[PDB]
């Protein structure tokens, strides 16, 4: 062949933290179909928003938005349990079909994005060199989102484990733990990675008895 059809830019979706998660990498030959399974961010979440992105930046907002759609009717469940399979399918004609399917209900929604959508050749070149000019700032952004997500995991899981502990937890411990979750929740709203890390560390330092109870509960 003298020619190939390739994706000039990565394609994916926005996930928690405002990050672009890639489903089809830059320079993949088409046709191609890739899938990954995602889940919900909150307890009792009834819907997910699939925000489709084109580009090479780690921040969703710095990539080109190809569309969005919602999948509703997710049944009540703890965060992280539902399985929402997202498939990106680019056919021989260069048309992108994005679908999200809830594997519990079998419910599905799609967006179709015609071959002409997204960034033109001048923006494509601008995008590739911006991703390169910014590899460092994007890395620091990725590390901050990762920290924030781990802190949100620690916040939520520790709250669930305080509740399952009930009176097994000594009152001194619960006071220390609860003041530290308040401090973590507050830090999570900011942009200071070391402050988040500091509040996570304080929670680990005051939660050793809680950790022991929760381990024993399922041991």
């Amino acid at each position: 062949v003298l020619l190939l059809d390739v994706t000039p830019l990565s394609l994916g979706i926005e996930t928690m933290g405002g990050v672009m998660t890639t489903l089809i990498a830059k320079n993949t030959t088409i046709p191609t179909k890739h899938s990954q399974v995602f889940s919900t961010a909150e307890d009792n979440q009834s819907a997910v928003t699939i925000h489709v992105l084109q580009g090479e930046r780690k921040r969703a907002a710095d990539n080109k938005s190809l569309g969005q759609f919602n999948l509703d009717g997710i049944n009540p469940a703890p965060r992280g349990m539902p399985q929402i399979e997202v498939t990106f399918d680019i056919d021989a004609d260069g048309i992108l079909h994005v679908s999200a399917k809830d594997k519990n209900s079998g419910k599905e929604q799609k967006i179709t994005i015609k071959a002409s959508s997204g960034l033109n050749e001048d923006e494509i070149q601008k995008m590739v060199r911006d991703a390169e000019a910014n590899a460092e700032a994007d890395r620091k952004f990725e590390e901050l989102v990762q920290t924030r997500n781990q802190g949100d995991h620690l916040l939520h899981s520790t709250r669930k484990q305080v509740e399952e502990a009930g009176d097994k937890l000594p009152a001194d411990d619960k006071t220390a733990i609860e003041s530290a979750l308040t401090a973590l929740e507050t830090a999570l709203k900011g942009e200071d990675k070391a402050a988040i890390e500091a509040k996570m560390q304080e929670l680990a330092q005051v939660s050793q008895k809680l950790m022991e109870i929760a381990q024993q509960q399922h041991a």
Binding site: M16, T40, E42, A47, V48
Partner: peptide
């Protein structure tokens, strides 16, 4: 409405 990995 966010998704996680």
């Amino acid at each position: 409405n966010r998704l996680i990995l």
